[PDB]
């Protein structure tokens, strides 16, 4: 009474104040009012608890009842928790497109989403077009990208190419985007991004009966299972349309099919905190899958 609050979107900082009574939903609704967002289903608020773990904020609960890291002001991240099946059909608003664009790019650059070198360079050139506008000989002299985080660290490491050489490659691509608007630029970035194998999938360390470490990916299209050393190749898939119920108890997940004659799929996951999030992503992705088909 009153508690200071800071929420960052990918491009802005917002300062608010809340009461001990304030629910997540209200703080969340404030953000979307300030940001002018209409496709709210994709997004959520993100915080650090007293332990130090990143957590999604529960909306139907009070904010001061969720053990947010005690500090002045309280820190939040407005971010996408769910991803569209296709960006062209589902990102109608400008701001929406912008927010997705900046988040995905950050994922690329921080090496959260795997991206090969040639595709990375083409992604960079769109982020350049979006930021610098039309290429211009007089303005964009050799070296104008020296102060830009353009390529992922993986790509810079995996070559014998120098700094300015990568920059020459991006420039060459930039020149060719000579007609493109900022809106179009961000979308082309996203259209290429969305087809990277690691795009829009949450990864979770899981186990089989033998205790073999594996990966479980939750995405828009359903669930996937990966080799522990290959996050790019799905080995077993469960499309949402084939699932009936997902639940967990302690450390064990049960997935029941629609078939009803088919057997339950079982796997294991270590921490309870992660399990809550796994559950939440499943329900949310399943919901949006169905809504797109009603």
């Amino acid at each position: 009474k009153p508690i200071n609050v800071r929420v960052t979107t990918m491009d802005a900082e917002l300062e608010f104040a809340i009461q001990p009574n304030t629910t997540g939903k209200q703080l969340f609704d404030q953000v979307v009012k300030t940001v002018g967002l209409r496709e709210v289903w994709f997004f959520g608020l993100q915080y650090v608890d007293s332990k130090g773990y990143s957590t999604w904020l529960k909306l139907n609960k009070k904010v001061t009842q969720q053990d947010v890291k005690k500090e002045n002001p309280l820190q939040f991240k407005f971010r996408a928790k769910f991803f569209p099946e296709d960006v062209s059909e589902e990102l109608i608003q400008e701001i929406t497109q912008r927010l997705f664009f900046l988040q995905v790019k950050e994922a690329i650059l921080n090496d959260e989403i795997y991206c090969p070198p040639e595709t990375a360079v083409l992604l960079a050139s769109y982020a350049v077009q979006a930021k610098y506008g039309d290429y211009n000989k007089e303005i964009h002299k050799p070296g104008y990208l020296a102060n830009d985080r353009l390529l992922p660290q993986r790509v810079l490491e995996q070559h014998k190419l120098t700094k300015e050489q990568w920059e020459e490659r991006i420039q060459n691509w930039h020149e060719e985007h000579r007609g493109m608007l900022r809106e179009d630029s961000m979308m082309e970035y996203l259209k290429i991004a969305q087809d990277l194998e690691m795009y829009g999938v949450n990864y979770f360390e899981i186990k089989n009966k033998k205790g073999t470490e594996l990966w479980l990916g939750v995405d828009a299209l359903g669930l996937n299972i990966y080799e522990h050393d290959d996050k790019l190749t799905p080995k077993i898939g469960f499309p949402w349309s084939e699932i009936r119920n997902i639940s967990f108890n302690d450390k064990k997940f049960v997935i029941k099919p629609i078939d009803k004659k088919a057997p339950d799929f079982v796997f294991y996951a270590p921490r309870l905190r992660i399990n809550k999030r796994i559950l939440a992503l499943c329900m949310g992705n399943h919901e949006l899958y169905m809504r797109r088909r009603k």
Binding site: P234, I236, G237, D259, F267
Partner: peptide
């Protein structure tokens, strides 16, 4: 990239095999 199409018994089988 789309996981190889298969039935549920096969899924449990392969998963246990890893």
């Amino acid at each position: 990239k789309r996981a190889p199409q298969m039935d549920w018994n096969r899924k449990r089988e392969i998963f246990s095999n890893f």
